A paper describes a structure:
Recently, three OFPs with novel phenotypes have been developed: permanently fluorescent LSSmOrange with a large Stokes shift (437 nm, 572 nm) and two proteins photoswitchable from orange to far-red fluorescent states PSmOrange ( 548 nm, 565 nm; photoconverted form 636 nm, 662 nm) and PSmOrange2 ( 546 nm, 561 nm; photoconverted form 619 nm, 651 nm). LSSmOrange and PSmOrange have been engineered from mOrange and PSmOrange2 has been engineered from PSmOrange using directed molecular evolution. Electron density maps show that LSSmOrange, PSmOrange, and PSmOrange2 have the same chromophore structures as parental mOrange. It consists of p-hydroxyphenyl, imidazolinone, and 2-hydroxy-dihydrooxazole rings.
Monomeric PSmOrange2 has been developed as an improved version of PSmOrange with faster and more efficient photoswitching. Analogously to PSmOrange, in PSmOrange2, position 64 is occupied by Leu pointing out at the importance of a hydrophobic residue in this position. PSmOrange2 differs from PSmOrange by total six substitutions, only two of which, F65I and A217S, are located close to the chromophore. Replacement of aromatic F65 (present in both mOrange and PSmOrange) by aliphatic I65 is accompanied by a dramatic decrease of the amount and intensity of light required for an efficient photoconversion. Replacement of aromatic F65 with aliphatic I65 and decrease of the light energy required for photoswitching imply that I65 facilitates backbone cleavage and decreases the activation barrier of photoconversion. S217 in PSmOrange2, forms a strong H-bond with catalytic E215 and both, S217 and E215, adopt two conformations. In conformation “A”, the side chain of S217 is oriented away from E215 and forms a H-bond with the main chain carbonyl of Y72. This makes E215 move away from the chromophore, causes break of a H-bond between Oε2 atom of E215 and N2 atom of the chromophore (4.4 Å), and provides formation of a new H-bond between the side chains of E215 and Q42. In conformation “B”, S217 points towards E215, forming a strong H-bond (2.6 Å) with its side chain and pushing E215 closer to the chromophore, facilitating H-bonding between E215 and nitrogen of imidazolinone ring (3.1 Å) that connects it with the protein matrix. Substitution A217S in PSmOrange2 induces the shift of E215 closer to the chromophore and cause formation of its H-bond with N2 atom, increasing polarization of the chromophore and its quantum yield.
Residue numbers in the entry: 6 to 64, 69 to 226
Amino acid sequence: AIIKEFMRFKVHMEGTVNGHEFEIEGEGEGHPYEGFQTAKLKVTKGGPLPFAWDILSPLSKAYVKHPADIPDYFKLSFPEGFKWERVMNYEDGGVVTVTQDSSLQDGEFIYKVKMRGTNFPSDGPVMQKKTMGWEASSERMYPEDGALKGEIRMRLKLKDGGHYTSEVKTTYKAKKSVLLPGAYIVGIKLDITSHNEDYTIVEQYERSEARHSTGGM
């Protein structure tokens, strides 16, 4: 009754990437029990961004479809919600660090995101805007030290046909005691469905579903 079959969200992000300061404000909506969501984002400070939008898109776990037999840590955390901290280590030394708060206010999810990105090479695909969206990912979720930890090897498509990899670690922490699942996998596909000419208005789509592992966690 706390999380309805349809839920909206608002997101505010503040960040710096290689020293470039920016802010994003957005609104999203989706069906949390179906693993479907969309969002429309606006760059409100620092636009147009001089780097690939794709590094920001993975910066909304309440909208993961969980089978009944896998406890849903994220949904169970509400109304209080949860928080997360993440490091994304890109293969060329680029690094993004993130904090996030997820709350429920006035019947919608509220996401506050703070991030810092550094060491993206000036001639690399992020600063040269040569990326073309993320391949589908498998986030391996593990209960550890009283939290849920996620690990991902993520692959960003490049305009030239190759891929640019990021090793991701996240700690997700509920704001109250919640039943922890065993270790499991969240399958994720995120698309940038539309954008204006300078990526100051961007729309995203994401589908996510939890599953049991088959081969070793």
